[PDB]
From Swiss-Prot, chain A:
Stated name of the protein: tRNA (guanine-N(1)-)-methyltransferase
EC nos: 2.1.1.228
Residues the record lists as binding S-adenosyl-L-methionine: 109, 133-138
Domain of life: Bacteria
Species whose genome carries this gene: Mycobacterium tuberculosis (strain CDC 1551 / Oshkosh)
PANTHER family noted in UniProt: TRNA (GUANINE-N(1)-)-METHYLTRANSFERASE
Keywords: Cytoplasm, Methyltransferase, S-adenosyl-L-methionine, Transferase, tRNA processing
Length: 212, 208
């Protein structure tokens, strides 16, 4: 897989060179390139943003700057991802599906986001997905790209064989500060253990994620 | 606000020293301390994990090492947060509420997670919340902590989906800024924005 992330704060992507995704990249499973959007500006201030048509709060990222960057970085086989509050929700199934992609490009917004015409124009050439990692507002799309890449590269790196929430886990010691490991886990009975884990997962899922 | 994040990968928390959260911290709005969990280990290999009781794939983080860390870092006023896919969903309302907290402690788990008794023991002393930033699985809790702190410090720095934005020029690659936004008619503009927000919200997020 090849991944490009375009941003005005390249350093925010530094966790992607660490631990699990760092290993995936070193191993040649994935090429990752992080680009400073400002390199496609041509004025003295290297400005990437300007006031919104129709008024409103804040600034909008200019289309011509983004247009040039994506012209150079993307092909017609690229999947372009734009992290935004206004996107459909990112889920495990999205992550699994994106392991089949050869080229992911992340266009990380700042301010009020990116002139909408960038995505309309990009969508003439390549597939585009506007995606939110959750129902909360971040100052930019960078740490959302970190989340999404880490989800993808986890799967890509290969996970061990083993919709409910995961149950609790325990390891040594068997008793700690007057708190005991549930005797079933010490019993060696794989049937009793599996049913116990199923029971607790079910109970958790009802309490914390009734939408599931 | 004072924030501690405990982790075996401290460098993953480096984005919090940049941009908007960086400014919050420099200004003395927020103290942030990032701690390496391994500093509370006492054996030669500084081990933080061991095999799970009752079998399974992967390792579990040991309670005694987490117990010591949190003993030293937390008080009875602390809100302890454990990022985990088994948690309730993090939302804007969570973020807003957490700006009222004096002490946030993030316990970032790795592998299969943290021995459950760390949270049970902690909850004797302090408030605790197990929280998921979304329905997907990450290798560790550090990038979930980045998301959560960034949401909170954004609010500290002071229902419909956001509609599209536009800036200059008025026409670009054959694509025009919708005439209403050029019209200066605030009545027509605010009605148009409502129309499009609602249409977006239906199309992508009918749960809203």
């Amino acid at each position: 897989m090849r991944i490009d992330i375009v941003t005005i704060f390249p350093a925010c992507l530094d966790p992607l060179r660490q631990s699990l995704p760092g290993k995936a990249i070193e191993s040649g499973l994935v090429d990752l390139n992080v680009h400073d959007l400002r390199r496609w500006t041509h004025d003295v201030h290297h400005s990437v943003d300007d006031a919104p048509y129709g008024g409103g709060p804040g600034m909008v990222m200019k289309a011509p700057v983004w247009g040039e960057a994506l012209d150079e970085i993307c092909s017609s086989e690229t999947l372009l991802i734009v992290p935004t509050p206004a996107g459909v929700l990112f889920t495990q199934a999205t992550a699994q599906r994106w392991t089949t992609e050869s080229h992911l490009v992340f266009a990380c917004g700042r301010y009020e986001g990116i002139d909408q015409r960038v995505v309309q124009d990009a969508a003439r050439r390549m597939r585009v997905e506007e995606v939110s990692i959750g129902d909360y507002v971040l100052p930019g799309g960078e740490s959302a790209a970190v989340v999404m890449v880490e989800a993808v590269l986890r799967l890509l790196a290969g996970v061990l064989g083993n919709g409910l929430l995961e149950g609790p886990s325990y390891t040594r010691p068997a008793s700690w500060r007057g708190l005991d490991v549930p005797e079933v886990l010490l019993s060696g009975d794989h049937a009793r253990i599996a049913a116990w884990r199923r029971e607790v997962s079910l109970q958790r899922t009802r309490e914390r994620r009734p939408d599931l």
